Amino acid sequence: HEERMNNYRKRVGRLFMEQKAAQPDAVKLPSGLVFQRIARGSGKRAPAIDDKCEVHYTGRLRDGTVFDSSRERGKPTTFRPNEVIKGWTEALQLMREGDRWRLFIPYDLAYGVTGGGGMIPPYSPLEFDVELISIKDGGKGRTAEEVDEILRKAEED
Ligand SMILES: O=C(NCc1cccnc1)[C@H](Cc1ccc(F)cc1)NC(=O)[C@@H]1CCCCN1S(=O)(=O)Cc1ccc(F)cc1
């Protein structure tokens, strides 16, 4: 039965997202995306919705299983914010070159009710660590001023 598995997946996944939101340096955005800043980069602009980004990353289920990783391919993968899941679209448009964040994405901002491919079941929250290596022809989105105001409103809740 997938319905019994989904009821379980819904409860423990909620607990997982509740745990990381309680971690000390974790930031919680109104959408539900929770992240932790690992490294602070020297970039000045964030990528726009259609900018190409050079990214090193690793994705984990909340039980520890890694389902994908760009380091075993060795070189960085190219993505656009308008090509990825919602949690990745929101995070990328707030990160500058050199930043390293750990993302905790609830299922409704990831692959949702259907799931993602083979190794990501329905109602699954996702854990990513993400490094933004560079942005093609420079970021054309948020400046450092726009980003800090979004974090300032977040920590104000
Ligand atoms: O799915 C995507 N866009 C379409 C879409 C669907 C639904 C909602 N919104 C958008 C993109 C682009 C992509 C498409 C097809 C691929 F084969 C690979 C990438 N992906 C991602 O957003 C995340 C983000 C981090 C990099 C890539 N992954 S990922 O690691 O989870 C992929 C993965 C999933 C399960 C695995 F077992 C292994 C790998």
Numbering used by the authors: 7 to 163
Can you quote the paper on this entry?
Macrophage infectivity potentiator (MIP) proteins are key microbial virulence factors that facilitate host cell infection, intracellular pathogen replication, and dissemination. They are found in a variety of pathogens of both bacterial and eukaryotic origin, including Burkholderia pseudomallei, the causative agent of melioidosis, Legionella pneumophila, leading to Legionnaires’ disease, and the protozoan parasites Trypanosoma cruzi and Leishmania subspecies. All MIP proteins share a peptidyl-prolyl-cis–trans-isomerase (PPIase) domain resembling the FK506 binding protein domains of human FKBPs. All MIP and FKBP proteins share a general domain topology in their core PPIase domain with an amphipathic five-stranded β-sheet wrapping around a short α-helix, thereby forming a hydrophobic active site32. Inhibition of secreted MIP proteins diminishes macrophage invasion and leads to the reduction of overall pathogen load and virulence, as shown for L. pneumophila and B. pseudomallei, respectively.
Here, we determined the crystal structures of B. pseudomallei MIP (BpMIP), which contains only the core PPIase domain and T. cruzi MIP (TcMIP), which features the PPIase domain and a free-standing α-helix (“stalk”), in complex with fluorinated pipecolic acid inhibitors. In all cases, we found that the inhibitor molecules bound within the expected FKBP-like domain cleft that forms the MIP active site. The spectrum of NJS227, which carries the same X1 moiety in addition to a para-fluorobenzyl group (X2B), features two 19F resonances. In agreement with very similar KD values for either ligand, the distinguishing moieties, i.e., the iso-propyl group in NJS224 and the para-fluorobenzyl moiety in NJS227, do not make substantial protein contacts and furthermore face in opposite directions. Comparing the crystal structures of TcMIP and BpMIP with NJS227, the inhibitor adopts a highly similar binding stance and the respective protein side chains align well (RMSD = 0.58 Å). The fluorobenzyl group attached to the sulfoxyl group, i.e., the group present in either inhibitor, is nestled into a hydrophobic pocket formed by F43 in β-strand 3a and V97/I98 in the loop between β4 and β5 in BpMIP and the corresponding residues F73 and M125/I126 in TcMIP. In the crystal structures, the inhibitor’s piperidine ring rests within a hydrophobic cage formed by conserved aromatic residues (Y33/Y63, F53/F85, and W66/W94 in BpMIP and TcMIP, respectively). Interestingly, for BpMIP, the NJS224 X1 line width is broader, while for TcMIP, NJS227 displays broader lines and thus presumably reduced flexibility. Finally, it needs to be noted that for both TcMIP and BpMIP, the X2B19F resonance showed a much more pronounced CSP than the X1 moiety.
